[PDB]
Symmetry: D2
C-alpha cells in the first residue's frame, strides 16, 4: 500500500477492461489518475466507480489524435499537478491475415496502436523529464509483440513496433539522465466483457496449445505488473519486456 | 551455382548498396531480377552493370506507392513470367530520438519502411501462392529490429514492425499450404558509398562496443544470406530472423 | 504490505547481497523465510539482522549438494510448515573466456549454478504441487542469460541453461495444474560489498556502453521483482523472463 | 559448388541423420571431412557412402570424452591438414519433465550435449585461431534452445547453455581477431530413421499446433544452413542463431 505515493498517471483506454483495472489499482496505491476513452457516458461512470475527482477523472480522447494529447496533458496537470506516469493502453484489433488486410484497416489500426503510443511517448518524455518525478512510461504491447498470429497481421506489426520503439526511448532517456523509464507489458489472453461477447473465444484461448495454464487471465493480472513498473520499486528497469501470458510464449 | 534456377525476383531499392549486391548474386545464381529505385538514370545503369535485359531490368518505383506495386508485379511477369521471390529492401532512416521525431518524418519513414513491406508482402502472397514456385518473401529488417538505438526512434518502430508482421505472414502462408515462405534478414553495419559519405561513421560503427569484429560488413554479406533464403535450400525456414551483424546483438 | 501473506520461502545464497535483500523484503511482506549460505557465522548473523526465528532462520547448505536439498526442505517445513516459494539465487562466477576455462572450473561452476537450480526446481515441484499454496519457483539468471560476455564463458552456459530449463518446468507445471509457477529474474550489474571489493568494477559497469543509466543497481532492485513473482499478484505469469538491468540488454 | 574450397571440417555424430547430411553436402562443396560416431561398423560404412578417404574419414569418439577430442583433432590434421571447421552435432535426448529427471540421466545428457560442445569449442578456438583459415564453429542447438518442452527438461537446459555459451565464444574470438566465428543452428523436427522408428512421432510433430508447415523437415534442410555458416559467405556472421523449424518458434 501507498506503492504509488505522489504519482500522477495518465491511462489511455482506462474506462474498460485492462485499463480500468490498472486505473483501479493505481488509485488504491495512492496515484492520482486521468483515464481516457471515446464515450463520456462510459468514462465518467468508470471514474466515479473507482473514486472521487480528487483521486481520478475522465478525459475524452482518441489516442490517434495528436492535438488532443496536448489537451490531455494540460487537463491532467490542471487537475493533479505534473504528470509522472503514462500507460499507453488504448488499442484496436483487425481480425485479418496480412493477405486479407485492407489498406484503410491497416492505416486505422496503426493510427491508434502505433501513432498513439508514439504521440504519448514523445509528449511524455518532454513533459516528465528532468523533474525528479521518478517518471515511467508503460507501453502496452502483447504476446503479439513476440510471436505471429496468422489472423492478426496489422496488430502484429503495431505490437512489434511498440516493443522496439520503446527500447529506443528507454535508451535515450537513460543516456540523457531524463529520470524517465520506458518498458513494455505483454499480456496474453485476458477475460474482459469484450471477450465474453465473442462466443467460443475464451474456450479457444484456454486450449493447452494456446495457454498452457488452460485458462485465460483477468484484468488485475496486468494491473499488478503496471503498479510495479509505475512505482520506484522498478527504478533500475528500463527498455525491458514484461510478459504475463499463462505460458503462451514459453512453448 | 544455379542455386536460384528458374527463380524470378523483385528487389526494392535494388539499384544501390545492399540491394544491388543481392541483385548481382541473384543473377549470378540464375534468377531473373527486376530491381526498383527512384531515379531512372541510376536504375538503368545499375541493371546494365549486372547483366542483359533477359537477366535483369529496372522498374522506377517508390515502395510507399500502393498502386505502383501492381504495375511493378505486372512489369516483372511481362518481362520474366510469374514472380517467385520478393526482397523488400527499400528503406530510409531519420536520425532522431523518439523525443525529437517530427510527425511528418515519422509518417514518411513508416510510409517507405512499413507500408512498403506490407504492400509488397500482401501483393506477393496473392501473386505467388499455390503455383509450386517455391516462393520466398525476404523482408529486410536490421539489428534495429532487435535492439534500440536512442537516435533511430522511428527506424526502430519500422524494423520491429517488419520483424513480427513477417512472422504473421509466414504462419498464414504455412497453415494454408500457399508454398510461400516469409523470413527477415537483420544486417548490422554494412560499408556502402552512402556510409563512405558520412565522415567518421565507419570508425564509429567499427568500435568494439558497437561491432565486436572491429570492422563493418560489405553488401555481399547480405547478398549471400538472401541467396540462401530465396533458394529451395531454405524450404523448411519460415517465420525466422537471420542476423549478419559482426556480433553487434550478441553482446 | 502483507503482499506475501502466509508464504513460506527458501532463498539459496540468502545471507549476502541480492539474496539478503530478497529475504529482507520477503519478511517485510509477511513471508516466513529460510536463507541458505556456506558459513554459519555469516548466516545466523544475517537471519538475526532481518528478524526473529518465527520470521526467518538460517540453514547451512551448498546448492550443489543434492542430499542437502532434502534436509533444507525438511528443516523449512519443520520451522514454518509447507514451503510455497523457492528462490534459486546461490551462484558463483569464473572470470575466463570459453578458450581459457579449465575443466575443473567448468564442472564446479555448473555444479552450483546449474545442478543447484535443477535440484531445487525438481524437489520444489514435488513438495509444492497440488497443495493450493500459490507456489512460485524464481530461478535467478542474469543479463548473461540473454547476451554473451567474452570473459564469462561457463557463467553464460549456466545462465542460458537456467533460462530455458525454467520454461520446461513452467510448461509441465501449467499443463498438469500443479499450482506451481516457474519464472527467471535477470539482474544486470548490482552494487554489493563483493563488487565494492574489486577496484574499478563499479566504474567499468557504469559506462554508458555497458549500463545506459550510467550507474549500477542495488540489491532491493532485485528484491522487489522477486516479491511480485512470489506473490499471487503474478498468478498468470509462468515461463517468463524478468529483466532489471538499467538498459544493458536494450542496446 | 566449391563453396567450401580448402575447408577441413570435423562433424561430431556425422555417421547418421543430420550429421551425415552435413558431411555429405560438405564433401560435395569441396571440404575435407572427419565424421565421428560411437560404432566403427556404422562410421566406416557412412564415410565410404559419401566419398573416398582423400575426401572423408571416420574417427570413433564420444563427444563427452575430453582426452578423445585431442586425438580427434590430431587424426584430422594428419589426414587433411589444419582443421578450419567444427560442427558440434553429437547429442542425446531424455524424455522426462524436470520433475521426473533422474540425476544420472541429467549428468549423462549434459556430458554429451553441453560438455561435448564446450570441449569441442574450447579446443577448436585453440587449434583454428590466427591461421587465416576462415574458421567456423557451428554449435547444433534446436528449437529447444528458444522454447520449453515440458517433457525435455535436461535437453532444454543443454540447448539453452549451447545457445548463450556460443555467443561468449563468438565475442571473445571477434574481439581478439582470432579469425574464428561461432554460430548456433536450431533445427525443428527433422525426419530421420530414428524418428521413423517411433510410431506416431512424425504425425504428432506435423500437427499445425507444433509445425505450422504441417510436415517435418529432412536432414538436407540442416545441411544447407551449415554449408552457409562453414563458408566464407558468412564471414560477417558470429554470435547468431539460425532457425530452420517450419514455423515452430514463430507462433
Ligand atoms: Mg510458441
Ligand atoms: Mg546488446
Amino acid at each position: 500500500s501507498n506503492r504509488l505515493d505522489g504519482k500522477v498517471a495518465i491511462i489511455t483506454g482506462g474506462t474498460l477492461g485492462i485499463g480500468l483495472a490498472i486505473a483501479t489499482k493505481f488509485v488504491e496505491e495512492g496515484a492520482k489518475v486521468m483515464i481516457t476513452g471515446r464515450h463520456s457516458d462510459v468514462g465518467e461512470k468508470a471514474a466515479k466507480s473507482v473514486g472521487t475527482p480528487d483521486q481520478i477523472q475522465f478525459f475524452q480522447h482518441d489516442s490517434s489524435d495528436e492535438d488532443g494529447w496536448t489537451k490531455l496533458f494540460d487537463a491532467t496537470e490542471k487537475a493533479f499537478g505534473p504528470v509522472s506516469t503514462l500507460v499507453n493502453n488504448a488499442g484496436i484489433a483487425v481480425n485479418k491475415s496480412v493477405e486479407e488486410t485492407e489498406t484503410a484497416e491497416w492505416r486505422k489500426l496503426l493510427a491508434v496502436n502505433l501513432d498513439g503510443v508514439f504521440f504519448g511517448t514523445r509528449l511524455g518524455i518532454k513533459r516528465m523529464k528532468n523533474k525528479g518525478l521518478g517518471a515511467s512510461i508503460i507501453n502496452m504491447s502483447s504476446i503479439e509483440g513476440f510471436v505471429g498470429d496468422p489472423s492478426l497481421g496489422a496488430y502484429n506489426a503495431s505490437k512489434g513496433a511498440v516493443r522496439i520503439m520503446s527500447k529506443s526511448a528507454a535508451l535515450d532517456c537513460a543516456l540523457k539522465d531524463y529520470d524517465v523509464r520506458v518498458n513494455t507489458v505483454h499480456p496474453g489472453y485476458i477475460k474482459t466483457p469484450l471477450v465474453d461477447d465473442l462466443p467460443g473465444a475464451e474456450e479457444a484461448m484456454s486450449q493447452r496449445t494456446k495457454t498452457p495454464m488452460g485458462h485465460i487471465g483477468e484484468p488485475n493480472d496486468i494491473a499488478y505488473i503496471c503498479v510495479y513498473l509505475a512505482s520506484n520499486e522498478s527504478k533500475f528497469a528500463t527498455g525491458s519486456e514484461f510478459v504475463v501470458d499463462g505460458g503462451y510464449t514459453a512453448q
